[PDB]
Design a binder for this molecule. Structure first.
Ligand SMILES: [Ca+2]
Ligand code: NA
Length: 269
């Protein structure tokens, strides 16, 4: 039996699927700890930029979980992604510890741009500015990638990097009451929010796990971007980003929420 995680329903992804919008033909790079093969995922390709970690398999779990929020297959098992037909690419930029380097993240962004990705999901952050990260985000954006990044889990009123940079779409986390999760970073640069508390998704070992974080919110938005791109194949990164914001459900102050809760149904009307 397939379960629909609450956040997938909350972003109204099933309604989009009922329109026939699934993310088919849309290339989504997951810049993370890898993606492990799983009965509820299809992985089309990828690359590793972690020294000494040559494979794209996930030695952590984080990247596999993020990937399932984007694209868990629509079937009789497991969970269900926002964009269950998206073409997933495992871009390993974080090691098994859950951390990476600017170098590695930047290389993954460069790979996404050079491989024609439509969306790059960055469920990751660094506390300090990094001109190398800024330039890699700008380069990927120039090449046509929509970069979507987590705001961070410190609870502070400023957001992590690279989310803080203008060309990364910054995603914070909400809870089941549609309030900002306590940990969700906010402030200048926040674009949008999505479910990030008690998010069930795929995990290595052909299993499932529930996690909290802005890392879990981010892939809901990446998946919604894929639905919009399937409907509107001519649209740029910027057009997609703006449409997601314009069709979000306002939750209050933009300082706390950006444009509010992403809404895949509204975004694909
Ligand atoms: Ca499934
Ligand atoms: Na940003």
């Amino acid at each position: 039996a397939q379960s629909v995680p609450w956040g997938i329903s909350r972003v109204q992804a099933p309604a989009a699927h009922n329109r026939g919008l699934t993310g088919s033909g849309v290339k989504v790079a997951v810049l993370d700890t890898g993606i492990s093969t799983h009965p509820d995922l299809n992985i089309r390709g990828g690359a590793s930029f972690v020294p000494g970690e040559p494979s794209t398999q996930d030695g952590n779990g984080h990247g596999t979980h993020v990937a399932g929020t984007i694209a868990a297959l629509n079937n009789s098992i497991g969970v269900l992604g926002v964009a269950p037909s998206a073409e997933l690419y495992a871009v390993k930029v974080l090691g098994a510890s859950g951390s990476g380097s600017v170098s590695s993240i930047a290389q993954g962004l460069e790979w996404a741009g050079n491989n024609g990705m439509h969306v790059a999901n960055l469920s990751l952050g660094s506390p300090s500015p990094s001109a190398t990260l800024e330039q890699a985000v700008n380069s990927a954006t120039s090449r046509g990638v929509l970069v979507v990044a987590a705001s961070g889990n410190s609870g502070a009123g400023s957001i992590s990097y690279p989310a803080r940079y203008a060309n990364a779409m910054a995603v914070g986390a909400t809870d089941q009451n549609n309030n900002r999760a306590s940990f969700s970073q906010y402030g200048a640069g926040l674009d949008i929010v999505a479910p990030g508390v008690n998010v069930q998704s795929t995990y290595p070992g052909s299993t499932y796990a529930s996690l909290n974080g802005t890392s879990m919110a981010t892939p809901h938005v990446a998946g919604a971007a894929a639905l919009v791109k399937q409907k509107n194949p001519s649209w740029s990164n910027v057009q997609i980003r703006n449409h997601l914001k314009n069709t979000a459900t306002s939750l209050g102050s933009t300082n706390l929420y950006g444009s509010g809760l992403v809404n895949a149904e509204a975004a694909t009307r």
